[PDB]
C-alpha cells in the first residue's frame, strides 16, 4: 500500500534523541555504560547510542535482567551533597 514494516533504527533512536514517544509510544532502551534500561526520555546526562539496546516492551529488557527506569531515576556522585559544574574555582 504505502509502507511495508517499521522504517529504521534511526527513526527509533531519533525518537530517543528528541524527548516525547515519536514512533513506538512504549519502546525501551538499554545503555550498558550507566547500567540502565529505561523508556525514551532519560534527560540527566545520558550515555550515547554506542552501547545502547532497544525493545518494544520493558518485560524483555527485564527478561534480560537490567535496571527498570519509569521515573528518569537521577544519580551523580551524591547530587544533593557535592556538585562543581566546572573546574574554574581558586579565589572569591
Residues that bind Zn ion (CB under 5 A): 38, 42, 69, 72
Instruction: Quote the least distance from Cβ 58 to Zn ion, whole Å.
Output: 11
Three-class secondary structure of residue 29 per DSSP? strand
Query: Concatenated DSSP letters for 41-90?
Result: ---SS---SSSEEEESSHHHHHHHT--EESS----SSSTTT---SSS--S
Tell me the binding residues for DNA.
34, 43, 45, 67
Q: Which of 38, 39, 54, 66 is catalytic?
A: 38
Instruction: Quote the least distance from Cβ 60 to Zn ion, whole Å.
Output: 16
Instruction: Quote the least distance from Cβ 87 to Zn ion, whole Å.
Output: 28
Active site residue 38: yes
Q: Of the two residues 75 and 88, which places its CB atom closer to Zn ion in the complex?
A: 75
Distance (Å, whole) CA 79 – CA 75: 6
Whose CB is nearest to Zn ion?
38
Instruction: Point out the residues that are catalytic.
Output: 38
Amino acid at each position: 500500500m504505502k509502507k511495508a514494516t517499521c522504517l529504521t533504527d534511526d527513526q527509533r533512536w531519533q525518537s530517543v534523541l528528541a524527548r516525547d514517544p515519536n514512533a513506538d509510544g512504549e519502546f525501551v532502551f538499554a545503555v550498558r555504560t550507566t547500567g540502565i534500561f529505561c523508556r525514551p526520555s532519560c534527560r540527566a546526562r545520558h550515555a550515547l547510542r554506542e552501547n545502547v539496546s532497544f525493545y518494544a516492551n520493558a518485560s524483555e529488557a527485564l527478561a534480560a535482567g537490567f535496571r527498570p527506569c519509569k521515573r528518569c531515576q537521577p544519580d551523580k556522585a551524591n547530587p544533593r551533597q557535592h556538585r562543581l559544574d566546572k573546574i574554574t574555582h581558586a579565589c572569591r
